[PDB]
């Protein structure tokens, strides 16, 4: 093909290869049922030719079209050959080519493809996504094929809607008999209806011929899961049943032979497949683990058994269950079922009272763990079955045990609150009567029961706050060795939360307009005395609740690390009641014993409150200074730069040639003096480095604006004379927080490269290279005449959101994160930030005038300059004409961003993985930006990583819906323009994007209190300067503060509760509203031209 002239070879080869692929699609015929080796040979030819650069010097799409091919047929052949990622890529290429051909002259494309080629694009995409195994991608395939009963049944099995699956399996009879019976049996088993399933299987024997292998497979599965030891190429469940039978009959040779046969058969079946996706390995791994556990139990039971051996095997089981924390329930449940069957067999074949109790205790612990695991997956029948089995084996006489608390939790999870509360209150009564919580074994159960009952009563509002406070929560704290510490921490946190709720209610009422209206009405004489008495009582109650909440928060922070993020709330309270002596005393006596690292995420805010106004032993400023000094003592590498920045707020004019600000500067100076008194060398070196950065930032570079190759730093700059800083860690590096205070093996600054580069920008920030102790170079961006503190605090919020996302398993399985970069402010107008490598602005990649993606691909559309001019010319006119102009521009400007992943990742597997990462990044960033009200999301403020395809958000100055105050406001929650959606693939926002948005929105909703307290702490920082001002508005587009603060807090609370336009919405409804608002051309046409809504 390289030497082809007049496209003769091209035409001939195209015709013959198309004929081959068409012949592969039959089903006899003249040529059909081709060997898979030949199909793979032709697929390899196509795959090789797809990656070669054509002489036309075009794009990757032309390279994909060396031969005139119909890629739908190739995609179907690849799917038949189990090349699922290749099939998906070829389907995407075919759809793109068909769209381009149509423009020259899914449902519509699917029906057209069915018309000529006889292949439905939608059906092929659904089959490919089913083969791949990614769960969310199955939701982007919707249309006329979602009404068939089999599709609905598979969907119901996806969400484990077993009742719906059972109903639909029983209803539809046109389904093939084997599939219907298998689905019915599986649904019955997943609902816990073991006896019903057994009777159903017995009734299936009537008027039935020889069973197909699936039927006896399910029969043997039900037999071994129900312990029906009566009835009897061996398959997996038959092998398991036979092995359990042999173990019961003390025939170990047959046991080991059956297990060996099962291992060999499972491995052979797994290895005969294609091994394309990781999701294809999980069932085999689960079955192999079950076989291994059974073999270990058989080896244990072969000889005499002791208590220590059973304890050891249960410990091993618990360790392996901990390894399976993120696995799906479909893979963990069979292992648990085999475990409980094994334990019950050991129970029934013991004949020894001493070890019988040990086996019973192990079985009870296993069944409690199974109940908890089933509850975590929103399963309500398996926990009930486990509780029933516990009751069968654990007929109690004392009446109090650990498993009954789990029974109460199970009843609560089933939305039967009366039963749960009655059980738990009866248990509390029994525990109180039995003893005074003096038994070490019953202390944990009593404390947990009291705390859970108090929390449940608080939720149901069935009891007044006084009784909840006095009878359950304070009692739980009083009742209360890692388990004891954990219980103490939980009780302390619950008491603190309840006290904080009461205090916040009192404060809200005192600030409420009803209270001031009552006061005004009284202003128009025993009434005055009564009001004075009521007001003093209200103030006393407020102070008592605040003190209790602060004390219990401090005690909670001292008992563990699971609730560290609550420290924000504590600080908030202490920062809003600085004049209260009791809070200061609690922070000085017990608050000074909290580990210092827990205060690290608030270090920007705390240091902003330094002053020299309230002094003395109980003075707020003295306590704050002591706390900050101790924190900086323990963690110099996380705090010292902030203190220097506070002290060096006005060093720019010092190096060239208000009361609160002066007090903060003096307090920072005394803190720095203390640090230098302990560590003089490090303080001196860091001060020298900060001076070097500040001097370099102020160096003018307006005469190097055009050049991009690289400019050597002038020799007179102090930055070039710093060498071998053995105690100065690189400032733009994420340093792992050490609970201890050694910080031994840290990469320190060694040298700075003599040359710096410019990447553009209005103020021309400078890119420099820092060589550390090892052979690694770090890029740093030094910026002058710009404020970087807002970026730093927004990055802190991003890190907190990242921790929240990692905390929840649902978003942790999808690896949903926010891309972050370290920012170190140095003064009021200078700073240095980490320059991520491999990142490029999306505007640079898309709408570059020279070699943008919109010019390389699709060169006959409007240029970016043309669109900009057209949209600018119509700004001062009516909104309707804006709409026609914007629609005309969008008609002649089509997205081309989907090629980004196509050019860089030629392997279909890597291309799929990178596209999925891109879509998840877009979803997470969009939702988090909406929650934080992040705005000014234009093409130059969003970067993409060329190695991971993920998105990074920069220039975070505008947030908290302040972009809606500018002239021509921003009427979108986030950027979801046509290029952004086009990068997501053929399904757009209908597959992975919507589900990931829902999963992160649910995470935000479940942590609304923490997000409110974090944002409340950060917004009342006197140094943030987040509100929009006329100067900022003019620059962006070429007390009252208190009121806007509570307005922003209220709007954030509404967002995190789901209340939009007064209507409360579910997560799905809120996400739908957000998406349809973001993609609406009506809003996009009303935006600023600099936002570039058409891109």
């Amino acid at each position: 093909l390289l030497q082809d002239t007049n496209e003769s070879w091209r035409n001939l080869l195209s015709t013959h290869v198309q004929g081959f692929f068409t012949s592969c699609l039959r089903h006899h015929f003249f040529r059909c049922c081709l060997d898979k080796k030949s199909q793979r040979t032709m697929l390899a030819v196509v795959d090789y030719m797809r990656r070669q650069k054509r002489p036309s010097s075009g794009t990757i799409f032309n390279d994909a079209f060396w031969l005139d091919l119909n890629y739908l047929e190739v995609a179907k052949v690849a799917q038949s050959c189990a090349a699922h990622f290749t099939a998906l890529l070829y389907a995407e290429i075919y759809a793109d080519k068909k769209s381009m051909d149509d423009q020259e002259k899914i449902s519509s494309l699917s029906e057209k493809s069915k018309e000529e080629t006889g292949i439905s694009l939608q059906d092929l995409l659904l089959e490919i996504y089913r083969s791949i195994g990614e769960p969310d991608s199955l939701y982007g395939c919707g249309g006329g094929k979602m009404l068939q009963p089999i599709t609905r049944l598979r969907t119901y099995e996806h969400e484990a809607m077993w009742g719906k699956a059972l109903v639909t399996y029983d209803l539809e009879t046109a389904i093939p008999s084997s599939t219907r019976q298998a689905g019915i049996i599986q649904a019955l088993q997943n609902l816990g209806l073991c006896h019903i399933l057994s009777v159903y299987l017995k009734g299936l024997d009537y008027e039935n011929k020889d069973w197909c292998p699936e039927l006896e497979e399910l029969h043997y599965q039900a037999a071994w899961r129900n312990m029906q030891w009566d009835h009897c190429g061996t398959s997996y469940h038959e092998s398991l049943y036979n092995a359990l039978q042999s173990l019961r009959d003390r025939e170990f040779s047959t046991f080991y032979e059956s297990l060996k046969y099962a291992r060999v058969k499972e491995v052979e079946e797994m290895c005969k497949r294609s091994l394309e996706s990781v999701y294809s390995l999980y069932p085999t791994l689960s079955r192999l683990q079950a076989i291994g556990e059974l073999e270990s139990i058989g080896e244990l039971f072969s000889r005499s058994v002791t208590h220590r051996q059973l304890s050891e095997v249960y410990i091993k089981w618990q360790k392996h269950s901990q390894l399976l924390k993120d696995s799906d329930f479909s893979f963990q449940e069979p292992i648990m079922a085999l475990r409980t069957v094994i334990l019950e067999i050991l129970m029934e074949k013991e004949m020894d009272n001493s070890q019988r109790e040990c086996i019973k205790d192990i079985l009870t612990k296993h069944l409690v763990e199974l109940s908890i695991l089933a509850r975590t997956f929103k399963n309500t029948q398996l926990p009930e079955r486990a509780i029933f089995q516990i009751k069968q084996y654990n007929s109690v006489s004392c009446g109090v045990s650990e498993w009954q608390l789990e029974e109460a939790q199970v009843f609560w999870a089933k939305k039967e609150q009366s039963l749960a509360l009655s059980i738990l209150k009866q248990m509390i009564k029994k525990l109180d009567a039995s003893c005074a919580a003096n038994n070490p074994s019953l202390k944990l159960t009593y404390t947990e029961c009291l705390r859970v009952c108090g929390n449940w009563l608080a939720e149901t509002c069935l009891e007044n706050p006084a009784v909840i406070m006095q009878t359950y929560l304070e009692k739980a704290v009083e009742v209360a060795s890692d388990e004891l510490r954990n219980g103490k921490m939980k009780a302390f946190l619950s008491l603190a939360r309840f006290s904080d709720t009461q205090y916040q209610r009192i404060e809200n009422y005192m600030k409420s307009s009803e209270f001031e209206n009552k006061q005004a009405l009284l202003k128009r004489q025993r009434e005055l005395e009564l009001d004075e008495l009521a007001l003093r009582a209200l103030k006393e109650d407020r102070k008592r609740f605040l003190c209790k909440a602060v004390e219990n928060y401090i005690n909670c922070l001292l008992s563990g690390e699971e609730h560290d993020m609550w420290v924000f709330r504590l600080c908030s309270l202490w920062l809003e009641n600085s004049g209260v002596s009791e809070v200061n005393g609690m922070m000085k006596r017990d608050g000074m014993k909290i580990p210092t690292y827990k205060f690290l995420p608030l270090m920007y805010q705390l240091a902003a409150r330094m002053g020299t106004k309230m002094m003395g032993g109980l003075g707020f400023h003295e306590v704050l200074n002591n706390l900050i000094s101790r924190i900086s003592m323990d963690h110099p590498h996380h705090t010292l730069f902030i203190i220097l920045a506070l002290a060096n707020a006005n060093r720019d004019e010092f190096l060239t040639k208000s009361q609160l600000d002066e007090d903060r500067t003096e307090a920072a100076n005394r803190i720095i003096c203390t640090i230098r008194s302990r560590r003089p060398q490090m303080v001196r070196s860091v001060e020298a480095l900060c001076d070097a950065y500040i001097i370099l930032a102020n160096l003018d570079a307006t005469q190097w604006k055009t050049q991009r190759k690289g400019i050597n730093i002038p020799a007179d700059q102090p930055i070039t004379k710093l060498k071998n800083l053995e105690d100065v860690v690189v400032p733009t590096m994420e340093i792992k927080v050490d609970h201890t205070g050694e910080y031994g093996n840290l990469v320190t600054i060694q040298s700075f490269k003599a040359e710096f580069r410019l990447a553009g920008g209005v103020n021309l920030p400078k890119i420099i290279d820092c060589v550390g102790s090892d052979g690694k170079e770090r890029r740093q961006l030094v910026k002058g005449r710009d404020d970087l503190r807002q970026d730093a605090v927004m990055q802190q919020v991003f890190q907190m959101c990242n921790t929240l996302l990692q905390r929840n398993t649902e978003t942790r399985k999808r690896k949903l994160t926010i891309c972050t970069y370290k920012v170190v402010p140095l003064s009021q107008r200078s700073g240095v930030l980490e320059w991520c490598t491999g990142t490029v602005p999306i505007g640079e990649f898309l709408v570059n005038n020279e070699d943008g993606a919109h010019k390389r691909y699709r060169p006959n559309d409007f240029s970016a300059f043309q669109c900009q001019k057209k949209m600018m010319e119509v700004q001062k006119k009516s909104f309707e004409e804006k709409y026609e102009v914007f629609m005309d521009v969008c008609q002649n400007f089509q997205p081309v961003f989907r090629y980004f992943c196509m050019e860089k990742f030629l392997d279909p597997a890597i291309w799929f993985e990178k596209r999925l990462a891109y879509t998840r990044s877009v979803a997470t960033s969009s939702i988090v930006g909406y929650i934080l009200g992040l705005g000014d999301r234009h093409v130059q403020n969003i970067l993409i990583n060329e190695q991971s395809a993920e998105l990074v958000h920069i220039d975070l100055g505008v947030a908290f819906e302040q972009g809606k105050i500018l002239p021509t406001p921003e009427t979108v929650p986030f950027r979801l323009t046509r290029d952004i959606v086009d990068g997501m693939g053929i399904t757009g926002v209908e597959g992975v994007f919507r589900r990931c948005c829902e999963k992160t929105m649910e995470v935000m909703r479940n942590s609304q209190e923490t997000l409110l307290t974090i944002v409340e702490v950060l917004l009342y920082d006197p140094l943030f300067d987040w509100t929009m001002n006329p100067l900022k508005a003019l620059y962006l587009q070429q007390q009252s503060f208190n009121k806007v603060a509570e307005r922003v807090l209220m709007r954030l609370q509404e967002k995190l509760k789901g209340v939009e336009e007064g209507t409360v919405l579910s997560v799905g409804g809120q996400v739908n509203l957000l998406i349809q608002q973001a993609i609406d051309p009506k809003n996009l046409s009303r935006l600023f031209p600099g936002w570039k809504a058409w891109v």
Binding site: V267, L285, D326
Partner: protein
């Protein structure tokens, strides 16, 4: 082998993979497989540590790499003298890891490294063909 100190679970797995770099009959690996399975049943806490370490870049984690390598080795043992004994050892090793969430979707098969560098060393599209065929 055990010079310069003992081996951790990660080191044992890396040694197994490094031996797997050499291509030979699957039966010759059988004994080594057994050793691996012993380690895999004695250092599950080290497995937890490995899984926590590999979460930053799940694509090149060692547990999914080991699973893929074992599956490929079992595939190469079909229709050979070592079948039904190599498969048993592979199943025993794979039962010591279980269905751990590897946080990846695609399988990479652990392509070669020197071959890619040698290919990148060439140009002109004809010397690359010569290298491949040679």
């Amino acid at each position: 082998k055990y010079s310069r100190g003992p081996f951790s679970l990660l080191e044992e797995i890396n040694h197994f993979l490094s031996v797997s770099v050499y291509d030979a009959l699957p039966l010759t690996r059988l004994e080594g497989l057994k050793d691996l399975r012993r380690q895999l049943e004695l250092h599950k806490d080290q497995m937890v540590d490995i899984m926590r370490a590999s979460q930053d870049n799940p694509q090149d984690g060692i547990m999914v790499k080991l699973v893929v390598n074992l599956l490929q080795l079992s595939k190469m043992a079909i229709n050979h003298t070592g079948e039904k004994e190599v498969l048993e050892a592979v199943g025993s090793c794979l039962g010591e890891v279980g269905p751990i969430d590897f946080s990846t979707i695609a399988i990479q098969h652990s392509k070669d490294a020197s071959y890619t560098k040698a290919l990148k060393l060439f140009e002109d599209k004809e010397l690359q063909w010569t290298f491949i065929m040679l």
